[PDB]
Design a binder for this molecule. Sequence first.
Ligand SMILES: [C]C1=C([C])[C]=C2C(=[C]1)N([C][C]([O])[C]([O])[C]([O])[C]OP([O])(=O)OP([O])(=O)O[C][C]1O[C](N3[C]=NC4=C3N=[C]N=C4[N])[C]([O])[C]1[O])C1=NC(=O)[N]C(=O)C1=N2C(=O)[C][C]C1=[C][C]=C(Br)[C]=[C]1
Lengths: 666, 133
Amino acid sequence: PSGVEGAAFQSRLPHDRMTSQEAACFPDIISGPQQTQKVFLFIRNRTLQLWLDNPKIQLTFEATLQQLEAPYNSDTVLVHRVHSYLERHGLINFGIYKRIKPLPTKKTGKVIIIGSGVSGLAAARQLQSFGMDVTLLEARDRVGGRVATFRKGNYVADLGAMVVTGLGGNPMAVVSKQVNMELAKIKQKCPLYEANGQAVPKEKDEMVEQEFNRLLEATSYLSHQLDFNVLNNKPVSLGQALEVVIQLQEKHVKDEQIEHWKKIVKTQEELKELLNKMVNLKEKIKELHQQYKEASEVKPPRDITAEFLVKSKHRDLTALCKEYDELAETQGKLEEKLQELEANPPSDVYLSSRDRQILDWHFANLEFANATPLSTLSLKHWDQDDDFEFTGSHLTVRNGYSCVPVALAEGLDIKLNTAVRQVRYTASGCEVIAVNTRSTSQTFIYKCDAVLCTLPLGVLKQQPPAVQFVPPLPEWKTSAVQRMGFGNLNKVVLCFDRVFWDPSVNLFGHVGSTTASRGELFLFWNLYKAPILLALVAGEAAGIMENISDDVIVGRCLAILKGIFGSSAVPQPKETVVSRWRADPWARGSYSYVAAGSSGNDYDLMAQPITPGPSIPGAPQPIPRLFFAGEHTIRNYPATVHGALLSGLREAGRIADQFLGAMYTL
Amino acid sequence: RKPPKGMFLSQEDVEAVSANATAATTVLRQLDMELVSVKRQIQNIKQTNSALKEKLDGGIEPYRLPEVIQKCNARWTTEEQLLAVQAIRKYGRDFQAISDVIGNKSVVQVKNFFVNYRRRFNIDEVLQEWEAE
Ligand SMILES: [C]C1=C([C])[C]=C2C(=[C]1)N([C][C]([O])[C]([O])[C]([O])[C]OP([O])(=O)OP([O])(=O)O[C][C]1O[C](N3[C]=NC4=C3N=[C]N=C4[N])[C]([O])[C]1[O])C1=NC(=O)[N]C(=O)C1=N2C(=O)[C][C]C1=[C][C]=C(Br)[C]=[C]1
């Protein structure tokens, strides 16, 4: 869609309806007349459009009223409420704009933000602009966290996120206008190559793929129709479901062959009956002809009983020949009706060895995309974030994704090399104790109104704790932390002095030999200006491969690459890098997923702020002190850059509301 | 609504393969076998049937007796009447057979005969003698 409704869509909003969150800011409107609702709705969409059409400079209440029309620019109390709501919750004026109204003279409130992820950064910028005093604590010697970009000479490669998933309703769209990103589309053509290095042919390729898609549909059917979601208490994983589907596809292939050959015996067993009746006919026929001959001896003129005999046996005989002829008739038909059945049997197998190996690459791609073994995904829930898929085709960041965090980072108070160790949150405020990552006995104490935590879920999961909460997080939070899933996925960066792959092709997959190794080096990306190939370790492999040295890895790699492009097309690589996200103490994995026995609702639990009890007993219930943002806290956009970035926009809103009040809700 | 066209999955079938850890590879072996156990039984009957085809060797060609090509007729010769009477003793009511045997009498003339001479040939008696066998 486009126009004023173009904006509402491009802002993940319904253009002709008020959201849950609007209903709360504007209860007066939504409980009111269908008539005002449309006025609100129009103001909103138009303001968004106004922002979207020019997101390189701040959009003011001034400039907004300015560009509205009667009847709508009549009620200015309203247009004010609306512009304010959109500003607060980050739908307008987010990212990196040029500011018209200068920065508030003295600041109000103080927020300590843990982690300078994209989520943290995004939150920090918001609050700062809202007039608060913000400081970020980052364990690493750089920003962007899970947005890492190898840089050296002219080599540029991301070992963190590398794909933008389509500009249709993505906030990154706005950002890409604000920051220098070279977005390049990913041509979805992906040739597969078998273990031996021989390209898999179109016939197979396409037929295996669609079986894969058919297999997924299948699983969905088990879940929603057949209600196959729990298998003696244990909740069903997608892997469990997929196996049960493949099994049933074999069980059918067999059931076929049976009642085909079982349909042959039944015919042979007729041919047998016939030939018996047919033999015992020859018997009698042979044995009558004899008698006829004997009775034909008796030379005419015979008496009549002797005549009768000759005449009579001659009937009896020809009579039985008429019979035996018709049985030779049947015999012939039964016998073609077996050339029929013997000629077209049903299918020999469900999938050949070689098929169920290609299907594995498809399952590998799916593990790559969820960072986890399909045997960990929840059946009912693994793809709940589905209906929110952006339109447009996927992209990559030619000049490296870090370009974004680096830009958000600009102008923010960031302490690098600072590892938070304990978070204390009490009725009167919070104190945060970090140490210097370089020399760790050196201690730091930051006191503040509120703490926004953007610790990866891998980090929140660690045993024993890498960060300590005082008092401890309530069991309803920690259970959300057990339950949720945090996957893993690594990259190998191969740097060469020459291209030797197909320059015009963006990706191509290697087909491993086993199920167990389907994740291992299964897919290569051609993304960047310099001669770099980038290969993925996904699924069950990803984790195992972290315990194997770089050299061994780069080896198994080159091998596979020689096996495709010929043994001496492929030089030694000039530079190599091998990610290990599960081992990285400030990540402990790559991104979350909906584990079996969880649900997207746990993501909502992840995001609810924490409110410390009272100091003096029977002092009134305070303000909430501890807030959460990050990839694992945004039900509808998990595991992504855009999704983090939004969670951060979200918290900044919710934090401001709490501490600077909400004028617009009256 | 329904499993993507082709793809096979039914309520009972699914409870069957999940009952334990190896119901999986059990129901798939009981079938793998029911298959060989029927493929064998074919190759067996195939050989039984191929023996019988040797016995029916050459057909029944050398035992056929040329066609009794001959026209019908209205008058009963004493010859024909005696042939008739015996056919009745041996074929009962199969007017078709009786016809063929006498040769030049239609399946109708025969049934007619049955009534006219019924009187003088004690055709009652002849028929009940055939019935008593
Ligand atoms: C790992 C990974 C890779 C390798 C790749 C990828 C990915 C991943 N993905 C995802 C992303 O990246 C994520 O999600 C984001 O980035 C997240 O964010 P946040 O939330 O912000 O977080 P971070 O960043 O991590 O931050 C945090 C921080 O903090 C800190 N710390 C810790 N601890 C501590 C600290 N500080 C102080 N103290 C203490 N203690 C750290 O260090 C940090 O900084 C992605 N995404 C996207 O969007 N794209 C892409 O491409 C990606 N990638 C791939 O390849 C695939 C994936 C995907 C998925 C889904 C979709 Br739809 C698409 C794609």
